[PDB]
Design a protein around this ligand. Structure first.
Ligand SMILES: Nc1nc2c(ncn2[C@@H]2O[C@H](COP(=O)(O)OP(=O)(O)O)[C@@H](O)[C@H]2O)c(=O)[nH]1
Ligand SMILES: [Mg+2]
Lengths: 428, 243, 125
């Protein structure tokens, strides 16, 4: 359990993936040239996880059927650091079709990716797991991504499969087949990934609009919250911590039931792009803003469900004793929103190094039953179109049978019912 | 038998635009080429020509797309043709026909889509009903020790299928008995002691299906090396399993 | 129509063929034509979210409160998918808000069952 192989697929996958590598390369003191220019040695203590040795190069693979984002990433600020051979980009696109990426033109390219996946895996002393960034409402990241997951699953059945899946919403993209793609993709993640961070774009939009007070949010405004959230939920993996050190230990503490591995991430404080928020929030503030709905990266109210498991990560120099008092308080004061039949389900870690720009931050990771609201929302949009069989010729023309839609819809509603099932279970 | 039917000839119907199309960089060409000869040439027949017909040239182009084609759609429609061939060609897959498709079918059991696993298994069942344990027994045991967990559970289930319909010729000393403990019970134990639950669940059945054929006291020796728990899951299937 | 009852107007209004719609309507295509499931071309236009088509359909006297087999009206479909601009135009052309589907959920009960804070504002303003 050491090295993590990172993969980004599709348009959104390579967007938030490149922005994530910019963030952690700075926190680890790595300039675009690949050299280390940091100061502390804790930055190099567990650099072997995400990077390799040079002469430091990211252990990342970039995949997309459309070569458009291939050049947008290489032209980016950190585009010169990625391995040239790790770019696996096909000829034609996916047309925002899950079936084109999963069955048709993504399967024609997936073998090229597994060759690069194998390459980075052979040079690993002990492969810890995999990490995927993609969008469920797209075509390549949704379709070809879930195919890559199921392919990695059959070739690395002993490694953890972790994903950063973003959720489609009408408030962002106006493509109508996104409920189809997300339903077909959720149908895969529930049976293939060991853990999945749900990144709702409807939540990201509502945050930039109603909290950061931005009238017209752009993708850079949305991807800023994503990169911050990704940096927090990965803090314990790249810095020498005691709790939830590797991928499996985190999944063993966060996933009580195999299909219920969909996490609701949170982060505080909610900063803007290059704005001014100097005064490091107090520990009681970081705790109150962590357990609210206005800082969740998923359009779900934690009041509507119960927390099965919780992982909190504080960053920056602070009183560890003052953290315990707050984390204890929010538990015994809101005990109804925490599962009783899982003792000590909340786990808090501390890291001295804050993210660049802040002195105190706190990242939330929750396995709440309220995440069923997110699936209820997608399942409602799915059926509205599916009852009229609109745009179904897209997927049937690529080989999919109409029954596949009914099954993916059924298994999602089963996942919703199960999240409600343990929301009603008691101790007695 | 009602197999006095007139043997029809279908090796003539293959159009010229086939070997080129079935070997194309466009998936649509390979899908449509396989589907036309399946729906128009193999579907509307029931008795093919056993004499003066070498289907081995056609069978190996099916195994090439079953084993190596990334289009899972073509893998389905191709394996179905294999099932249709060995069905409509009873007592035909002596050695070459049976072996040209066996190991590509076992390798392609990795596919998890139920429609695809259905097509590949049903063809594996159809080649087994006319080649009981020619290469199957020896080749199936090899793929129970394969690195992929999916091909382990499916090849193990496939042995149970052949093991169920095992009638043999008799009286005793068949290929199964001399491999009972040297190789067969050893390959089943690897499944019984696999790290995954669903995989072990297959071996529990496969072991219980084995105790159904040969006296349960004959396999009491490897039964004692097993956990008392794994003994109860094996005795579990022994009540449900028959033949 | 075909075996399903779908007209050229249904399929043009579904897949955003405005030029095909405006022409079929000039030469007298029934705007309220229903398929075997009771879907009017306004239903499918509000579903996919073709704003220019929805208005052109209404301007030729589209039944704005038609019901399909499942009990949904074009206001239900424009709301479930979140085509807020179409949600407005329907109401401005007399879209009844109290229509209950077979499940009994109206337009305001769908803005609630999915927590649409945007839709709840427009739906009662
Ligand atoms: N947060 C965020 N979401 C994105 C971004 N780009 C695309 N998306 C979302 O992804 C969906 C489209 O998938 P996309 O990545 O463009 O297609 P793909 O190339 O086949 O994976 C839409 O619903 C968008 O909301 C991005 O930069 N940030
Ligand atoms: Mg897009």
């Amino acid at each position: 359990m050491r090295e993590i192989v990172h993969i980004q697929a599709g348009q959104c996958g390579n967007q938030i993936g490149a922005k994530f590598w910019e963030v952690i390369s700075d926190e680890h003191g790595i300039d675009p040239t690949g050299s280390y220019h940091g100061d502390s040695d804790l930055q190099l203590e567990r650099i072997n996880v995400y990077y390799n040795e040079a002469a430091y190069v990211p252990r990342a693979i970039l995949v997309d059927l459309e070569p458009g984002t291939m050049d947008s990433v290489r032209s980016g600020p950190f585009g010169q650091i990625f391995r040239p051979d790790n770019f696996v980009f096909g000829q034609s696109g996916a047309g925002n079709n899950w079936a084109k990426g999963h069955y048709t033109e993504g399967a024609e390219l997936v073998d090229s990716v597994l060759d690069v996946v194998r390459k980075e895996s052979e040079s690993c002393d002990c492969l810890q797991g995999f990490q995927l960034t993609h969008s469920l409402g797209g075509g390549t990241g949704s379709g070809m991504g879930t195919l890559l997951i199921s392919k990695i699953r059959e070739e690395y059945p002993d490694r953890i499969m972790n994903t950063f899946s973003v959720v489609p919403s009408p408030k962002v993209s106006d493509t109508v087949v996104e409920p189809y793609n997300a339903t077909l993709s959720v149908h895969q993640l529930v049976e293939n990934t060991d853990e999945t961070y749900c990144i709702d774009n409807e939540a990201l939009y509502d945050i930039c609009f109603r909290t950061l007070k931005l009238t017209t949010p752009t993708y850079g405004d949305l991807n800023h919250l994503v990169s911050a959230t990704m940096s927090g939920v990965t803090t314990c993996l790249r810095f020498p911590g005691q709790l939830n050190a590797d991928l499996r230990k985190l999944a063993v503490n966060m996933v009580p039931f195999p299909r219920l591995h969909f996490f609701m991430p949170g982060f505080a404080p909610l900063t803007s792009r290059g704005s001014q928020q100097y005064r490091a929030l107090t520990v009681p503030e970081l705790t109150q803003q962590m357990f609210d709905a206005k800082n969740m990266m998923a359009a779900c109210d934690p009041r509507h469900g119960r927390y099965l498991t919780v992982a909190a990560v504080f960053r920056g120099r602070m009183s560890m004793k003052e953290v315990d008092e707050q984390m204890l308080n929010v538990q015994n004061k809101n005990s109804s929103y925490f599962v009783e039949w899982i003792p000590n389900n909340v786990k808090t870690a501390v890291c001295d190094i804050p993210p660049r720009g802040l002195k105190m931050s706190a990242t939330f990771i929750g396995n709440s039953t309220a995440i069923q609201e997110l699936f209820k929302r997608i399942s409602e949009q799915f059926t509205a179109m599916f009852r009229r069989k609109a745009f179904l010729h897209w997927y049937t023309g690529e080989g999919m049978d109409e029954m596949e839609f009914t099954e993916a819809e059924s298994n999602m509603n089963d996942l919703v019912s199960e999240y409600q099932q343990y929301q009603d279970a008691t101790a007695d | 038998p009602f197999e006095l039917l007139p043997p029809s000839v279908i090796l003539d119907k293959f159009p010229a635009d086939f070997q080129t199309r079935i070997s194309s960089t466009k998936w649509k060409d390979r899908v449509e080429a396989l589907e036309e000869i399946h729906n128009n040439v193999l579907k509307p027949v029931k008795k093919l020509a056993h004499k003066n017909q070498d289907y081995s040239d056609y069978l190996r182009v099916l195994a090439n797309v079953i084993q190596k084609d990334a289009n899972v759609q073509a893998v389905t429609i191709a394996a179905n043709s294999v099932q249709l061939l060995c069905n409509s060609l009873r007592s035909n897959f002596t050695r070459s026909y049976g072996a040209i498709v066996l190991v590509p079918l076992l390798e392609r059991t990795k596919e998890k889509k139920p429609s695809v696993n259905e097509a590949i298994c049903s063809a594996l069942d159809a080649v087994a009903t006319y080649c009981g344990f020619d290469d199957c027994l020896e080749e199936t045991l090899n793929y129970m020790k394969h690195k992929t967990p999916q091909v382990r559970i499916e090849c193990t289930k496939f042995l149970t299928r052949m093991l169920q319909g095992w009638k043999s010729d008799g009286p005793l000393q068949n290929q199964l008995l001399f491999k009972l403990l040297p190789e067969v019970t050893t390959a089943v134990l690897k499944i019984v002691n696999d790290t995954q639950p669903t995989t072990r669940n297959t071996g529990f059945e496969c072991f219980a299906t084995l105790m159904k054929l040969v006296g349960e006291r004959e396999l009491a020796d490897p039964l004692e090396k097993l956990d008392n728990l794994k003994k109860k899951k094996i005795y579990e299937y022994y009540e449900k399993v028959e033949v | 129509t075909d075996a399903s009852g779908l007209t050229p107007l249904h399929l043009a209004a579904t897949y955003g063929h405005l030029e095909i719609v405006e022409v079929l309507l000039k030469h007298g295509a029934d705007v309220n034509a229903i398929d075997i499931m009771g879907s009017t071309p306004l239903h499918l236009a509000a579903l996919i979210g073709h704003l220019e088509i929805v208005e052109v359909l209404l301007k030729h006297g589209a039944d704005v409160n038609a019901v399909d087999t499942w009990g949904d009206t074009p206001l239900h479909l424009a709301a479930i998918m979140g085509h807020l601009e179409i949600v407005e135009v329907l109401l401005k052309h007399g879209a009844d808000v109290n229509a209950q589907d077979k499940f009994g959920k109206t337009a305001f009960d769908i803005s609630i069952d999915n927590g649409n804070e945007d839709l709840a504002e427009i739906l009662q303003k």
